Amino acid sequence: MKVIVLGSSHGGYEAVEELLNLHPDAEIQWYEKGDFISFLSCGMQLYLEGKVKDVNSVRYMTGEKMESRGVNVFSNTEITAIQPKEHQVTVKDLVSGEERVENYDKLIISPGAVPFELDIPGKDLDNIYLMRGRQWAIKLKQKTVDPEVNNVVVIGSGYIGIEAAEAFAKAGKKVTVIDILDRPLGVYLDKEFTDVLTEEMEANNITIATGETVERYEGDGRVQKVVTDKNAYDADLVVVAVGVRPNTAWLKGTLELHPNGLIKTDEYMRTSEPDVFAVGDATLIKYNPADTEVNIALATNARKQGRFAVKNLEEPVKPFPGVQGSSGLAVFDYKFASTGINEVMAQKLGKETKAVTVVEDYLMDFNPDKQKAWFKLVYDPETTQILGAQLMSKADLTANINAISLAIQAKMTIEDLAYADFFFQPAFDKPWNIINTAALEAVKQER
Numbered sequence: 001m002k003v004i005v006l007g008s009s010h011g012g013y014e015a016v017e018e019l020l021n022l023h024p025d026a027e028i029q030w031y032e033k034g035d036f037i038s039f040l041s042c043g044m045q046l047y048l049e050g051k052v053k054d055v056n057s058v059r060y061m062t063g064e065k066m067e068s069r070g071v072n073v074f075s076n077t078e079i080t081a082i083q084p085k086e087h088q089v090t091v092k093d094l095v096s097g098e099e100r101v102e103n104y105d106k107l108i109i110s111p112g113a114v115p116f117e118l119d120i121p122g123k124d125l126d127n128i129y130l131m132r133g134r135q136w137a138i139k140l141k142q143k144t145v146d147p148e149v150n151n152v153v154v155i156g157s158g159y160i161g162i163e164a165a166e167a168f169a170k171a172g173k174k175v176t177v178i179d180i181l182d183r184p185l186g187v188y189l190d191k192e193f194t195d196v197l198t199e200e201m202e203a204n205n206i207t208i209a210t211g212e213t214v215e216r217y218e219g220d221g222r223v224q225k226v227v228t229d230k231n232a233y234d235a236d237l238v239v240v241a242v243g244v245r246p247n248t249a250w251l252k253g254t255l256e257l258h259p260n261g262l263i264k265t266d267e268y269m270r271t272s273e274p275d276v277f278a279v280g281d282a283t284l285i286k287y288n289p290a291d292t293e294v295n296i297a298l299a300t301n302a303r304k305q306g307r308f309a310v311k312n313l314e315e316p317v318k319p320f321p322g323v324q325g326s327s328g329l330a331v332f333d334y335k336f337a338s339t340g341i342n343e344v345m346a347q348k349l350g351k352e353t354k355a356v357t358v359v360e361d362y363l364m365d366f367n368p369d370k371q372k373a374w375f376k377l378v379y380d381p382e383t384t385q386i387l388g389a390q391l392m393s394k395a396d397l398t399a400n401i402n403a404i405s406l407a408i409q410a411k412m413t414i415e416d417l418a419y420a421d422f423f424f425q426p427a428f429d430k431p432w433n434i435i436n437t438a439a440l441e442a443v444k445q446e447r
């Protein structure tokens with residue numbers, strides 16, 4: 001059986017791992033058009049703040065290691081096209097120019113996403129940077145110590161935007177963050193969490209310019225101004241972190257795509273064409289909070305999907321169990337995490353929800369180590385089933401979001417969580433811990 005896997009990032013890497021322990025026998029070929037196998041873009045923040053010195057160590061596999069295992073790795077080799085009927089791909093060696101056609105029995109593709117750019121006048125004067133992959137990591141690092149860079153503008157206040165904003169603010173620059181939405185991180189967190197994080201960011205001289213539409217970049221040769229409908233901001237560097245678009249235009253006509261470019265797949269990772277599976281940022285995933293499919297471009301999703309595509313390689317035998325959209329991040333002193341439905345997700349999906357927010361010290365009164373924690377529990381008004389949660393504190397309480405993710409998946413209710421057995425010891429929590437306390441509040445509100 002010869003299996004060709006496209007992509008060395010998180011979806012293609014786990015497909016090779018599951019092929020190694022489920023079909024040890026197979027002939028596996030692993031292709032990467034880039035020069036570096038399995039660079040972890042997720043570690044970009046740790047590197048930019050100097051926690052990690054070596055950019056080449058921010059990775060989880062090397063080609064040499066996979067080759068010890070019998071996989072054939074082809075870096076600097078691009079898959080140009082798929083011929084689904086004749087079970088062939090045409091590959092181009094990017095260092096010599098040599099094209100060749102390679103045959104396969106099964107193809108798993110994890111082509112990923114690419115940074116979306118604003119296509120406006122000024123579109124590319126120099127020093128308008130993107131944030132994905134090794135090369136942009138190195139270039140962004142160089143600008144961190146550049147004495148000529150004083151004003152940084154980042155466009156987009158979602159996860160990548162707020163990570164570029166914190167790394168440049170910590171390096172000493174003046175940062176302005178621009179978004180069309182009205183709250184930084186609104187996609188992930190609700191108003192009661194983002195009001196506290198706006199304060200923290202402004203305390204570290206980050207200006208949040210929300211509710212603004214960038215119209216053009218101005219400058220001679222390199223960027224100098226970012227002008228929006230309401231304002232112009234001086235900029236020596238712009239980082240554009242406005243979201244991701246699927247890397248699938250080369251597949252138009254070959255595989256069925258949704259209108260937005262995402263690949264159509266079913267719950268066994270099968271595409272519209274026999275023997276080719278698709279995984280990762282370029283696909284939709286079963287979203288259990290709302291029993292629908294959603295694009296949730298996260299590494300955890302891509303890794304799980306990549307393994308489930310190998311499970312259904314020969315027979316659709318194992319449907320994907322679905323995910324709740326869990327994500328977390330530290331912004332300056334705050335460590336937060338959310339899962340399931342928040343206000344922006346419920347609006348998008350037309351889901352009506354109820355919520356309680358509890359803000360109080362997570363340790364008992366006499367304990368001097370006590371700090372505030374914010375916990376919001378979102379539930380269904382009819383069944384009172386758990387639909388999502390958001391938590392934040394300067395203490396790390398984020399592993400608790402993992403218990404809520406299981407509670408959404410098992411369809412538990414506010415009453416289940418009000419009395420669920422979570423340990424008490426006064427150096428770690430209160431006798432009704434953070435999940436128990438918010439669920440007890442929801443029970444009273446529905447009494």
Ligand SMILES: Cc1cc2nc3c(=O)[nH]c(=O)nc-3n(C[C@H](O)[C@H](O)[C@H](O)COP(=O)(O)OP(=O)(O)OC[C@H]3O[C@@H](n4cnc5c(N)ncnc54)[C@H](O)[C@@H]3O)c2cc1C
Pocket residue numbers: 006007008009010011012031032033034041042043044077078079080110111112113114131132133160247279280281282297298299300302
């Ligand atoms: C700054 C940053 C921080 C992030 N942090 C986190 C985090 O902490 N937690 C989290 O869960 N997620 C995080 N993510 C998201 C996560 O990195 C992605 O969800 C995940 O990498 C997507 O996996 P993928 O395999 O679908 O695609 P991609 O990572 O986009 O990888 C696509 C790969 O396939 C290769 N390829 C594409 N086309 C071809 C071709 N035709 N021929 C050959 N090779 C090809 C590409 O060169 C690339 O190597 C972050 C992303 C970024 C940019």
Ligand SMILES: NC(=O)c1ccc[n+]([C@@H]2O[C@H](COP(=O)([O-])OP(=O)(O)OC[C@H]3O[C@@H](n4cnc5c(N)ncnc54)[C@H](O)[C@@H]3O)[C@@H](O)[C@H]2O)c1
Pocket residue numbers: 118155156157158159160161178179180181185186187212213214241242243244296297298327328329
């Ligand atoms: N901690 C994590 O798990 C982690 C960290 C970084 C990235 N990732 C994932 O990688 C993906 C890409 O991250 P991202 O930060 O690029 O996207 P994102 O979706 O998190 O946020 C994009 C932001 O851009 C804003 N925006 C859109 N168009 C705009 C415009 N024209 N002008 C101004 N603002 C605009 C959006 O409103 C949103 O706030 C996401 O799926 C993200 O969740 C996750």
